[PDB]
Structures are given as C-alpha cells and as structure tokens.
Enzyme design. Structure first.
Site, PDB file in Angstrom:
ATOM      1  N   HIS A   1      35.511  41.231  52.046  1.00  0.00           N
ATOM      2  CA  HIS A   1      36.777  41.646  52.653  1.00  0.00           C
ATOM      3  C   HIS A   1      36.894  41.127  54.089  1.00  0.00           C
ATOM      4  O   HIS A   1      36.941  41.879  55.063  1.00  0.00           O
ATOM      5  CB  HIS A   1      36.913  43.161  52.588  1.00  0.00           C
ATOM      6  CG  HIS A   1      37.135  43.683  51.202  1.00  0.00           C
ATOM      7  ND1 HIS A   1      36.143  44.296  50.468  1.00  0.00           N
ATOM      8  CD2 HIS A   1      38.234  43.668  50.411  1.00  0.00           C
ATOM      9  CE1 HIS A   1      36.623  44.643  49.287  1.00  0.00           C
ATOM     10  NE2 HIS A   1      37.890  44.273  49.226  1.00  0.00           N
TER      11      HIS A   1
ATOM     12  N   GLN B   1      31.361  41.939  35.568  1.00  0.00           N
ATOM     13  CA  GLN B   1      32.516  41.048  35.627  1.00  0.00           C
ATOM     14  C   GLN B   1      33.287  41.063  34.314  1.00  0.00           C
ATOM     15  O   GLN B   1      34.523  41.028  34.311  1.00  0.00           O
ATOM     16  CB  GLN B   1      32.069  39.628  35.972  1.00  0.00           C
ATOM     17  CG  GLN B   1      31.739  39.427  37.440  1.00  0.00           C
ATOM     18  CD  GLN B   1      32.865  39.877  38.351  1.00  0.00           C
ATOM     19  OE1 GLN B   1      34.000  39.416  38.231  1.00  0.00           O
ATOM     20  NE2 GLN B   1      32.556  40.790  39.265  1.00  0.00           N
TER      21      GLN B   1
ATOM     22  N   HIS C   1      39.184  36.198  52.301  1.00  0.00           N
ATOM     23  CA  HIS C   1      39.902  36.962  51.286  1.00  0.00           C
ATOM     24  C   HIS C   1      41.370  37.125  51.655  1.00  0.00           C
ATOM     25  O   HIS C   1      42.253  36.991  50.799  1.00  0.00           O
ATOM     26  CB  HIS C   1      39.246  38.328  51.097  1.00  0.00           C
ATOM     27  CG  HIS C   1      40.038  39.264  50.239  1.00  0.00           C
ATOM     28  ND1 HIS C   1      40.260  39.035  48.898  1.00  0.00           N
ATOM     29  CD2 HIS C   1      40.668  40.426  50.533  1.00  0.00           C
ATOM     30  CE1 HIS C   1      40.987  40.019  48.401  1.00  0.00           C
ATOM     31  NE2 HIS C   1      41.249  40.876  49.372  1.00  0.00           N
TER      32      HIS C   1
ATOM     33  N   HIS D   1      46.712  42.888  54.665  1.00  0.00           N
ATOM     34  CA  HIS D   1      46.478  43.938  53.677  1.00  0.00           C
ATOM     35  C   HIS D   1      45.056  44.487  53.697  1.00  0.00           C
ATOM     36  O   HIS D   1      44.834  45.589  53.187  1.00  0.00           O
ATOM     37  CB  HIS D   1      46.816  43.431  52.272  1.00  0.00           C
ATOM     38  CG  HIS D   1      45.660  42.815  51.548  1.00  0.00           C
ATOM     39  ND1 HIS D   1      45.318  41.486  51.681  1.00  0.00           N
ATOM     40  CD2 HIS D   1      44.779  43.345  50.667  1.00  0.00           C
ATOM     41  CE1 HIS D   1      44.269  41.226  50.921  1.00  0.00           C
ATOM     42  NE2 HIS D   1      43.923  42.337  50.295  1.00  0.00           N
TER      43      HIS D   1
END
Ligand code: A1D8Q
Ligand code: A1D8Q
Ligand code: MG
Ligand code: MG
Ligand code: ZN
Ligand code: ZN
Lengths: 322, 322
Positions: free
Chosen positions: B71, B280, B75, B111
């Site tokens: 993050h 995943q 990203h 964001h």
C-alpha cells in the site's frame, strides 16, 4: 444539602435539572450520572470503582462547553436522566440486558461532548477541521464519540477497566451505534424503522414487547436516546421554555457568525426574522410529535403522560401566537 | 526518454508501473497522474496550473509510505492508471462528465494515502489512535480521504482552485463516496448492487450505458475504482506475482506484530503456516472473479481480455498447488 432532595426525583419525567445544575456547582452531569449508576446498581454489576466514576464524569463534564447555551453539560445530564426513565417503561421490561442499559446511559452522557454550538452543516460549509476529519458525515457525532472514549484513557478514568474484553467490545459498538443515531439527518430513517417495528410489533399478552435480534433492539435504543435528545417539548412547561431560550440563543449566535462571515443564514437562525413560537409548534408538529406518538404506540400505553404533556405544551405555544 | 517511452502505454492494461516507478525516481504517482491529466486535457478543462498540479502530486506521493510493501505510491499509481483505462471503455463513452472523470481519478490517487500497512481490524484490535478517531468504521478509508483533501491546503497545492463552488461541492462528495466504497467490508453489498444493475441495465441508442441519476452513476464509479483496487490478478502474470509478493510481505509483517503481541494471527498473515498459492486461488474465486465477471457483464464485451487474463492467472496459480 437540598441537592439531595432534588435528586430523589431522579426517576421522574420533569427533574429540576436546572436547579440541580445550580445546586451542584454546575455539575449536573456528574451528580445525575452518579445517582443513576447507584439506582440501577452499576458500580457493582460492572465493578466500577466509585472514584474512577467521579474522575471520568468530572473530566467528561469539563469537555462540554460552558459558553454554549444549549449543547452543554445540562443538556447531557438531561438526556442521561431522560434515557434512564425511558429504560423503565413497563412495556420494555426484560428487553435489555445490563450491558445494553449501561450502553444507552454512557452514550447519553457523552453524546454531545465538546459541542462547539454550531450545526454539522455550518461545520461543512466553513471547511472546518472537524468536517475535514470526518468527511462531512455525522461530523459532530463522530467527534462526540471520539472524545468520549478518549477521556477514558486519562488517569483513573477507565470506568470500564473490569469489563471483560468482549463486554468492552460489545459496549463500544453499541455506544457508537447509539450516538451516531442522534444525528438529526438520520431522524426519518430511524422513525420509519420504529414505525415498521410498531406495525410488525410482537408482544406478550401481558403488554410486554419481545425483541429477539440485535438489529431490532439497538434500533429501539437508538430511538430511545433520540427520544431523550428530543424530549424538551415533553417536559413541564417551565423546563421546556428554558430549553427553548437556550437553543434559540445558540441558533441566533450561529446566524450571527453566518452573517459576520457573510454566508446564508440557516433556517430559524436569523434573530431579525425569527418566529420562536411558530418554530416550536412546527418542531412539534413535524418532528417531536410524530416521533413521540410512534414511540407511544411501541410502548402502548406507558408513554401517555409524556404524549399528554407534549400536546399540552404544543397548545400553549400555539396560544402565544396571535 | 525511456520514461516517456513507457508512459506511451498509459492507455494500456498492463502498463509496467514498476518500471515507471524506477524510471521516474520513485515518482510513479506524480508522472502517471500528470500524463493522464494531459491526456484527458484536464488542466485546460479545470484551469489547473501545471506547477500546482505537480506540487500537490509530489506532496500526495510523499504521504504514501515508502517502507510499506504493497500500500505505497506504486499501488496508488497502479489504481489511478487502471481506473483511467476503465473510464475509457467503449460502453461508457461520453457517459461521465469531466468532473466525474476528475473525481474518479483523484479518488484513485488519494484512496490509500498514509496507509500504515495494517488492516482496519488490526487498528481496531490494537486500540489505535486511528480507530479511536473514526469509531471503528472504515478507519483507513476515512483517514485516506482526510489526508488527501487536507494536502490541497498546503502551499500551492489546491489543484481545484478554479472550480466553481458547486463543482467543488459535487467533486468532494463524489470522491468521498468513491473512496469509502474501497473498504472491503462493503464489497459484498457493493457487488450485490452491481449485480442488480447488470440484471436491469439500460443502454442508449448509441449502445452506451444509461445512467440518469446520481445513485446509479456514483455506484458505477464506486465499483470501477473498487475493480481497479482489486485488479492485480487481472494483469499480466509478471506484474501479478510481484503484487502478490508485496501483499504477502505486508500480511506477514502484520501477523508478526499480532504474534509478538499475543493476538491471534489474522488469516494468511502467519508465515509459518501460509499457503500463498491457495490463498490467491481463493482470493480470485470468492472475490476478484465474481467482481470482474460482473463488471465484464456491465460493459460487455469490452472487458473480455481482462477477464480472460484473470482466468489464465487463476489457472496458473492453481497449477502450482499439486
Ligand atoms: O435544533 C436541533 N438540531 C439538532 C441536531 C441534532 O443532531 C440533534 C438535536 C438537534 C436539535 C434539537 C432541538 C432541541 C430543542 C429545541 O427546542 C426546544 F425544545 F428547546 C429545538 O428547537 C429548534 C427546532 C425548531 C425551533 C428551534 C431543537
Ligand atoms: O487483502 C486485502 N485486504 C484489503 C482490504 C481493503 O479494504 C482493500 C483491499 C484489500 C486487499 C487487497 C489485496 C490485493 C492483492 C492481493 O494479492 C495479489 F493480487 F497481489 C491480495 O491478496 C491477499 C488476499 C488473499 C491472499 C492475500 C489482497
Ligand atoms: Mg448531538
Ligand atoms: Mg484501501
Ligand atoms: Zn443532544
Ligand atoms: Zn487500495
């Protein structure tokens, strides 16, 4: 001295909260919360040490603004005492556990803490730091919660120190859910749900109401503290009129800041064009009575004495209009 | 030169954002946002001074944490560019105003700003100052918004300085609505609403999606940025695997602090008992593919290649388990 006598009516609609504020040295929040914690036996049900309760209640009361006419410690004490009474409606008995009762009471006590005396819309329109922090959504109510929980971390102020971890976690969630619901922008949704619960209401043949899922219950507790927040027009007239004086002083002082800063005067905040009595009767007709009549239906009919006084005070205010 | 060559791919799914991070001196967010604003002619449309744009983007990029594995600013740049491509899809041509396009790209940029590399639940369970401030509700996402808007007030940073008051009001609300929708705890409801829209979707005579009210328009922009936020498994595999490397580092480091502090380790955060490949596969099967399959239906057939890559990558991670 006589503080003691006034407090003996802690269970009655129409407590002389303004006297109790005068007599307690401007500490109605502390003494009313204290008294109520005893009356409901919470210092032992949750093993709250008495000096920890006082230290928190004193710090909490200090974070209400004494230069704010309505949203101060007297309003907090008044909502606490009013919630305390609505928790004893006969039609609710056996509905709420002790933790839910402690939630509605603690929430009532912190529900306006650090109120600056202006509306959420004012904070939004002014690009305030509060609205920047909380993204324009229930700005005040999030702040009240943040401060109310934050003060617990002061020295000897964690009145919840002996709640289990899950009890603490459940209490925190319920308090947040309750205080967030005091935002007037959520009044209509909250009332629609209270009406739905009235239509699909389920009840013992012996009057008492049956709530099973957390969703329904917290919805009652939200509307309950919402009631106590909007309970001024249901109290005896001499109390109600003082509350009206105080909220109008707060509205006018906000309108004066809207005027000095040169923005639009919010509704009912223009001291040069305000009709205090027509506003009160509109407040009752469109918000307070639809709310308290729906709540009276839910607890049919332990709310009659309160719905009566409301209709009396509405008739009186209407009579003040030529 | 080489950077300008890579930035020619800014309209392409699978832009090599990690290369651009290196080639730009760890400024992927600044250069990709700048390129996209030039591409969409946004500096002229909204009279954004180029020096103000660059100054804000660099300040915004600074407030992403360079020591957080996933993050971070890479990203953010990835989600900006992925949103940019999704906005250009033929089924949405001339649907959204320039202000809505500006809102979606800006929302994508801020964001995740100042993300500390731990989840909301961790911030709630560690009694963080952030969870205290935001009352356990969308703690990170409210914080990202507060930071992204606040940095507009630094020196020569208000890139919205020449929008009208109404444009700024409308953009601020849309950006708030979009970023709050990136909270994964809202994914189930957001996908349920997206499904409903697909089942009842309307197209214009030009074949383009018909959105004639704010609720429908903001819902598409919400899911678009949500899709861009969950687009790693739809990218070419060499990009996907490096995103998986980075998110697993972040998870393991959170699980380390959970174990260090006596807390139960969150799912997939325990390096001594992690299943990267199976996780995943489950991530795609239960979250990413249901989302992207629904988005592909909404814009059919514009997203068929993206959905095909997702299913190829799913098959590949699956094949590494036997
Ligand atoms: O005006 C208010 N805005 C609010 C927003 C909230 O999130 C919660 C409560 C109030 C509130 C309460 C209020 C409390 C008492 C009032 O009058 C009286 F009962 F004291 C009153 O009257 C105002 C509404 C119309 C006239 C002035 C308003
Ligand atoms: O794990 C996550 N929690 C989140 C919460 C949010 O509010 C928004 C995004 C994510 C998120 C994203 C994510 C993004 C990429 C991932 O893997 C890969 F594509 F890079 C990934 O994998 C994790 C979930 C299952 C296994 C690890 C997770
Ligand atoms: Mg309030
Ligand atoms: Mg996020
Ligand atoms: Zn109040
Ligand atoms: Zn993200």
């Amino acid at each position: 001295d006589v503080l003691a006598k006034e407090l003996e009516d802690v269970n009655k609609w129409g407590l002389h909260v303004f006297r109790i504020a005068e007599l307690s040295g401007n500490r109605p929040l502390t003494v009313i919360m204290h008294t109520i914690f005893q009356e409901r036996d919470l210092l032992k049900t949750f093993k709250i040490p008495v000096d920890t309760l006082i230290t928190y209640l004193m710090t909490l009361e200090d974070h209400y603004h004494a230069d704010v006419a309505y949203h101060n410690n007297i309003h907090a004490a008044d909502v606490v005492q009013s919630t305390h009474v609505l928790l004893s409606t006969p039609a609710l008995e056996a509905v709420f556990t002790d933790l839910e009762i402690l939630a509605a009471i603690f929430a009532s006590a912190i529900h306006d803490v650090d109120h600056p005396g202006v509306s959420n819309q004012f904070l939004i329109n002014t690009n305030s730091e509060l609205a920047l922090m909380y993204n324009d959504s229930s700005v005040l109510e999030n702040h009240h919660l943040a401060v109310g929980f934050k003060l617990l971390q002061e020295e000897n102020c964690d009145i919840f120190q002996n709640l289990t971890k899950k009890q603490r976690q459940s209490l925190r969630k319920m308090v947040i859910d309750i205080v967030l619901a005091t935002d007037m922008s959520k009044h209509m949704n909250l009332l629609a749900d209270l009406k739905t619960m009235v239509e699909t209401k389920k009840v013992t043949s012996s009057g008492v109401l049956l709530l099973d899922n957390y969703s329904d219950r917290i919805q009652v507790l939200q509307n309950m503290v919402h009631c106590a927040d909007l309970s001024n027009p249901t109290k005896p007239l001499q109390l109600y009129r003082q509350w009206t004086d105080r909220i109008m002083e707060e509205f006018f002082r906000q309108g004066d800041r809207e005027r000095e800063r040169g923005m639009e005067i919010s509704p009912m905040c223009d001291k040069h064009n305000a009709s205090v009595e027509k506003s009160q009767v509109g407040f009752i007709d469109y918000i307070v009575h639809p709310l308290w009549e729906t709540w009276a239906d839910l607890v049919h009919p332990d709310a009659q004495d309160i719905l009566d006084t409301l209709e009396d005070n509405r008739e009186w205010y209407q009579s003040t209009i030529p």
